[PDB]
């Protein structure tokens, strides 16, 4: 099961805070079945990718994402540095490239004047070697389906979203710088991907503090409002069954104005 | 120890096979033992069929309740100078009665542990009738009258599942007692055998005194005692089967006779075993099973096709669109086919072929380098090929398709070399899949690549010929231009016309092959005749000296025609403008070198693959479920497979099984086209392959790990369980399955689906606990309306025609015994602790004794008795103001006072007992409020008392009336005096609860060591239960088993063997 | 003589003659150990699927299936990506209904368990003593 | 019915379940009642081991709000569509350039309120054109978006 809350979650500190109790969900047994998923990196990738694209494309991509299916990026050096990484240590070369260009990578000769290595390198493109290869200008809707289908996804840019970003080469080759799930997974950024994905009711969109989570939830309520699964705190509790200061739990009361001035009950305001 | 497996004997294993060409025995042991000293195992959950019993085969016992002792005349028996103690065969007591202990005198090697235990009726017996469905109820001494019937039916099932045993021969001893001359009395196994001789033979103790036991033994006859008949075949000097007189009961010996008749119909002979193993081996190896002539051998194996089919239907219903329960079976068949298969694969053949082909210096693109970088010959894994070979067996459960990533990206185009090689790999890989829309996918992949240069007619205005081949997966999407070749105009689309024509000619034809043996193993084939195995590929007889280029082979001919059409596509360079370089020469050379490659994989798939499939297939736990392969006939393509639980003549709500909710026939399985193509293009035999040597050496250690001899017994228990379940569920709840209406007087309720699901789950786990299983049994029948009658499986074609298969369920011994014990419970209801009729709550104060189980007719009244008010649901109570009497409402509308004879139903009191007792207690205790409460069935307990003292029953009656709650009821307390032989003084007693019909049947005798019973209830020894002793004209085989169960019946004792399944496996030249 | 129980129950001068030899000079050509290790797993029966069935008391058994089957397929033979997948098929089947613990037997939900439902149903009417 | 305290509801729900002890007006009415009209009496099962589609129950309920919710359900059932018509509509809008697939199997049931008639589209379009009047800075981002 997947449940979405309006808070920044992590696998580490959100259980020590007692986050679901801080929303009012009664899970007092501490049967540690509610596995968390850290969303620090997807909030920071959201921060980085709102620089480049429209927020409409960004949010409408990010919604349709199965957070249960594990996947991870691996980004590449540029096209004219990737061959240099293939030159030293020639053993780490995938079998897809060319038998004509593999023989020209694996030899010891310095290849200073390139008469046909120039042609084999200019006519080379990454797209026939690595199969997804998202792009630099990919219209980021398709990123999410590429990460839902596979589990390793090759890319050539930084502005990606959805998973952590691992390096293919060592750190000197660049010019731009598994998880335990136990069937009651909770964490922000809802999904419309699967049945059994739920969104937490309760707090208004008006009173969300992070303002990027608030922007996201405003869009996910302004579209898709019919097909969500809004459940109350009590329904979440029934489905289950360095202390910080300056962070108060907070509620709103719902009183009314009444007179008993003539010995009679009468509600006015 | 070794020759006893063959049967001849001198002065713990399961199967023992020995080879003939090597010194390597292979034996199987059960998986429960701690010491598996390098021996093979038995992973199948086999049930425990043969279970021996040595003790007494009775299920009724005689318990005393109130003991006493009397001055006797004769004290002991005398020798010259020795005194022998008198041992009575019956309990000497004041009141003794019959209760039910299953196996109280029973030495059992392996128990069923499904016991029915009755306390004496002074104690409580409510847990037997609250164990089943009363999971809420408060007042732990209570049970629900709505599930009395469920309790009784489950208890009778427990009785039957206990009494399934076989009897031993244990040993005899000649007697010279002066009352029993020469009768060879049987000795039980144990420390002391003289202990059981008094209780097992009631006629051995003579007539010393003047008592009921004494003149009963005087009334009995003398010769019918001990051994009656024996066999004529003996090992050593002891008989194989013997017929004895002893105490027993006709019910349990009838159940054990029926179970013996079942197993005696089941047994088989090693000659048929070795015939079966030879016919499964198919002439590559010859077995034999030598043995000595013997009769008492037993191995319960020979079963029927219908039982195999019902077990197959349950195994299909197990899956229910779960990929987890279908992955490891295809995985293990793939691993097994690889490890037996003589073929090995190396893509070094492809690399050595394409090593000489290279392309010049100024060239951008090269076709040979493109196809090597696309095929990836460095990778060495071939799972898709073996899983396709596995899925040929399980067409009907799983379907195998090619992954969508193997298709050309974004539709693809003919102007691109990579898309041409993708089409090549795909067009070779497609015919090995169990997809009926695979030729249409092979056609429309090309047509999608050919959008823009060649056109076809389309049927509607909606779709276009640039619609991808991933979508065309169901026969309502096949184009008319493909199904009729003449619609494609050869002046517009020559290449596409040729592609359609090559698909229609040279597609591989389906075929069929024989396997196993249906003569003695049976078969689980449902929609095929039970000996054939459907294949998508034609097969031939196998020889290794056939040429590699063989265009009579379907797969070699297919590779040749596909390479020829791709060469025809490349021919003119019309379909590829913008190619500024002539690639036609290198492309044609590469296509020729792919057309001419020495792959022995098509030869293998033609000849040796279906033979080893037919070898492996009968030895599987989940035997193959196949649905017919059609080539291009659209109207005969199967689409949907369902399972029916309901009957044929009943119009019942449509609960379609979950296997119907698939787009294809079964669960979709995605394979890789690349691995299938590389495995098809590269493959070789070892260079000294002898078929007889290789296949004998491969078939020996896999038949040494066979499982069919436990799988058949598991299918027995599955079929018996289904036929028991339909009888019990149709008995408890309303449906249209007729079972004989044995008990309906026990009150019940019209059970809904959750109630029937609970009851059927308890039946299931009781039978699994009985036969000692841990695997599934009848659990897929319990998800959604377990009220069913018979199983059936069916599929449909495209044109709407459905093929229905209904396996005829045979007669079943377990349900026969359950119906028999229900029939005998109809008359012997009192002995299990249940009374019929109903009760009357009313004060009777007198010095008379009449044992209120058997009341005189002056105290009872029916609905036809005049002056009796009959009530119903709408009784309302008005209070009488100003001293007038309060009134209660008649059913007829009248208001009647609290006086006279009433008739309730029990539910009327059960609704609001707290108001009713507050209104009624003083009127019952002091006034005249004799109430007859219609109950039907009720448990009961007995509180005895001394009738010569004053005694009262209002505390017991009021405690019962307070303890009656809406959800349950306690056992009804009775109060019945103690019979005495001497005369007693009379004291008054107040009795409140009496029965209405006779229930004093469980009583055995009163004052057994007395000459007569003066005061109290009188009952001598029941002469009718001991028929063959008292009646001289009764033959020894006569039982009046439906009316009254007899004790002291005629029991036949056995001594069989169970040898392991042995064979000597000889190779074939 | 007594056989132990697997699952718990309700109670809970003769000289040497020239035939014999031992050096035996032969190796099995497909081998024996590899074929035995292969046929162990084929000997293994099909896994039970008791899910959706009622339990002992009366409640259902609440125990992504294609994803886990593909993951076990990838774990089996030394891979990260599997050649034999059960999700990411080209065929759309959005109507796959496996058995689920959300549904009871009789056409409703399993938000409350059936024993709790029956307990509330019979506790809706009780009757105590007068004062 | 779901809730924290679901025990007190069953007396309110089915008034004809109580026995009839007294000659109270409540018990007179319950004795005047007719027995067999309690709870479930119809259901629509399609798939084995799945939820029933719709039932009819004898429970306490205002017929006014029954009629209102029934007409709302009739409105949404008029808007209901199947995915096959969605597939055909998306293919015809795609002009064959983009394919979509839909399953061919007995579904459980689905409620997708999307279809309306032409009059609603015309009225909404008239209101939207009346919304954008003589302004040239509210239509500018639309043309920039299409660019």
XYZ file of C-alpha atoms in Angstrom, chain B residues 461-670:
210
model
C -12.040 4.627 -41.188
C -10.631 4.317 -37.654
C -7.401 2.360 -37.934
C -4.413 2.774 -40.235
C -1.725 0.374 -41.480
C 0.739 2.227 -39.219
C -0.708 0.468 -36.165
C 1.967 -1.356 -34.197
C 2.258 -5.127 -33.974
C 2.087 -5.098 -30.166
C -1.653 -4.438 -30.338
C -2.740 -7.307 -32.616
C -3.080 -9.932 -29.900
C -6.704 -11.132 -30.134
C -8.464 -12.603 -33.220
C -10.931 -9.708 -33.567
C -8.035 -7.642 -34.978
C -6.857 -9.771 -37.905
C -7.162 -7.890 -41.212
C -9.227 -9.219 -44.088
C -6.362 -8.436 -46.470
C -4.264 -10.894 -44.468
C -6.934 -13.562 -44.145
C -7.666 -13.436 -47.890
C -4.448 -13.148 -49.885
C -6.086 -11.953 -53.117
C -7.073 -8.561 -51.672
C -3.433 -7.437 -51.611
C -2.719 -6.038 -55.061
C 0.588 -7.360 -56.475
C 1.109 -4.228 -58.579
C 1.249 -1.987 -55.477
C 2.739 -4.232 -52.773
C 4.907 -6.992 -54.281
C 7.135 -7.522 -51.223
C 4.149 -7.446 -48.876
C 2.145 -9.798 -51.110
C 5.105 -12.193 -51.069
C 5.351 -11.887 -47.280
C 1.672 -12.744 -46.790
C 2.016 -15.615 -49.260
C 5.107 -17.025 -47.524
C 3.283 -16.842 -44.172
C 0.308 -18.709 -45.639
C 2.456 -21.424 -47.226
C 5.503 -22.113 -45.072
C 4.236 -21.540 -41.542
C 5.033 -24.599 -39.378
C 2.165 -27.062 -39.048
C 1.015 -28.349 -35.649
C 1.227 -32.049 -34.875
C 0.746 -34.519 -32.033
C 2.807 -37.178 -30.269
C 2.041 -40.078 -27.935
C 3.349 -40.199 -24.374
C 3.047 -42.004 -21.028
C 0.574 -44.815 -20.848
C -3.185 -44.368 -20.366
C -3.653 -48.094 -19.757
C -2.439 -48.192 -16.148
C -1.461 -44.610 -15.210
C -4.500 -42.825 -16.551
C -4.243 -39.295 -17.863
C -5.082 -35.735 -16.857
C -5.836 -34.633 -20.422
C -9.024 -32.570 -20.546
C -9.634 -31.272 -24.074
C -7.410 -33.731 -25.967
C -7.712 -37.508 -26.324
C -5.820 -38.808 -23.316
C -2.679 -40.132 -25.048
C -1.568 -37.315 -27.359
C 0.498 -34.184 -26.771
C -0.143 -31.158 -28.961
C 2.836 -29.399 -30.531
C 3.253 -26.269 -32.658
C 6.053 -27.893 -34.710
C 5.938 -30.943 -36.973
C 8.174 -33.847 -35.966
C 9.860 -36.755 -37.736
C 11.651 -39.939 -36.671
C 15.101 -39.154 -35.348
C 18.414 -39.944 -36.984
C 21.622 -37.988 -36.631
C 22.799 -38.546 -40.228
C 20.409 -36.114 -41.869
C 21.850 -33.115 -43.758
C 22.132 -29.736 -42.087
C 20.649 -28.005 -45.115
C 17.261 -29.731 -45.275
C 14.510 -27.629 -46.814
C 11.976 -30.335 -45.982
C 12.486 -29.192 -42.390
C 9.975 -26.501 -41.465
C 12.388 -24.318 -39.499
C 15.230 -24.546 -42.025
C 12.731 -23.822 -44.811
C 11.438 -20.862 -42.790
C 14.915 -19.387 -42.325
C 15.583 -19.853 -46.044
C 12.356 -18.132 -47.123
C 12.820 -15.216 -44.704
C 16.415 -14.676 -45.867
C 15.250 -14.867 -49.489
C 12.523 -12.263 -48.932
C 14.905 -9.904 -47.144
C 17.312 -10.304 -50.058
C 14.364 -9.501 -52.358
C 13.684 -6.381 -50.302
C 17.295 -5.258 -50.649
C 17.514 -6.200 -54.401
C 16.651 -3.067 -56.345
C 17.392 -0.236 -53.882
C 13.964 1.259 -54.376
C 12.896 1.081 -50.737
C 16.030 2.908 -49.577
C 16.583 6.308 -51.146
C 19.256 8.404 -49.551
C 21.698 5.502 -49.351
C 24.538 7.275 -51.143
C 26.628 4.085 -50.990
C 25.927 0.739 -52.664
C 25.193 -1.564 -49.721
C 23.483 -4.192 -51.878
C 26.602 -6.360 -52.329
C 27.623 -6.550 -48.666
C 23.996 -6.878 -47.544
C 23.354 -9.758 -49.957
C 26.582 -11.472 -48.906
C 25.702 -11.184 -45.220
C 22.189 -12.507 -45.889
C 23.634 -15.441 -47.823
C 26.030 -16.241 -44.990
C 23.113 -16.156 -42.547
C 21.021 -18.381 -44.826
C 23.866 -20.914 -45.019
C 24.916 -21.582 -41.422
C 25.334 -24.983 -39.783
C 22.819 -24.717 -36.962
C 21.677 -28.152 -35.811
C 18.995 -26.521 -33.647
C 16.221 -26.902 -36.314
C 17.207 -30.562 -36.706
C 17.013 -30.884 -32.923
C 13.616 -29.181 -32.604
C 12.357 -31.375 -35.440
C 13.525 -34.726 -34.080
C 14.841 -34.912 -30.532
C 12.938 -32.153 -28.723
C 9.408 -33.713 -28.822
C 10.753 -37.124 -27.801
C 12.360 -35.777 -24.638
C 9.270 -33.643 -23.995
C 7.200 -36.836 -24.121
C 9.736 -38.523 -21.833
C 9.655 -35.770 -19.199
C 5.906 -35.015 -19.368
C 4.309 -37.984 -17.470
C 6.713 -37.598 -14.527
C 5.613 -34.121 -13.629
C 3.754 -32.930 -10.516
C 1.545 -30.611 -12.601
C 0.704 -32.676 -15.708
C 0.320 -30.734 -18.955
C -2.768 -28.655 -19.704
C -2.987 -28.063 -23.444
C -5.448 -26.133 -25.608
C -5.370 -26.870 -29.367
C -2.903 -25.179 -31.698
C -4.572 -23.883 -34.853
C -2.455 -22.577 -37.705
C -4.405 -19.756 -39.362
C -8.058 -20.763 -38.894
C -9.467 -17.707 -37.116
C -12.852 -19.170 -36.149
C -11.164 -21.997 -34.208
C -8.712 -19.912 -32.169
C -9.296 -20.348 -28.426
C -9.777 -17.123 -26.496
C -11.044 -17.762 -22.969
C -10.831 -20.610 -20.436
C -13.249 -20.853 -17.519
C -14.078 -23.166 -14.626
C -17.667 -23.930 -13.595
C -18.644 -24.879 -10.047
C -22.428 -24.953 -10.428
C -24.595 -27.650 -11.986
C -25.854 -28.011 -15.544
C -29.634 -27.840 -15.049
C -29.547 -25.003 -12.489
C -29.939 -21.336 -13.418
C -27.436 -19.783 -11.030
C -25.808 -16.362 -10.718
C -22.774 -15.992 -13.032
C -19.561 -16.297 -11.034
C -16.970 -16.467 -13.792
C -13.596 -17.783 -12.689
C -10.598 -15.464 -12.635
C -8.850 -17.280 -15.493
C -11.366 -15.731 -17.903
C -10.044 -12.234 -17.153
C -7.042 -12.436 -19.465
C -6.615 -10.773 -22.838
C -5.030 -13.913 -24.277
C -5.959 -17.484 -23.232
C -3.864 -17.506 -20.070
C -1.309 -15.422 -18.215
C 0.925 -13.462 -20.629
C 4.638 -14.256 -20.547
C 7.141 -11.979 -22.265
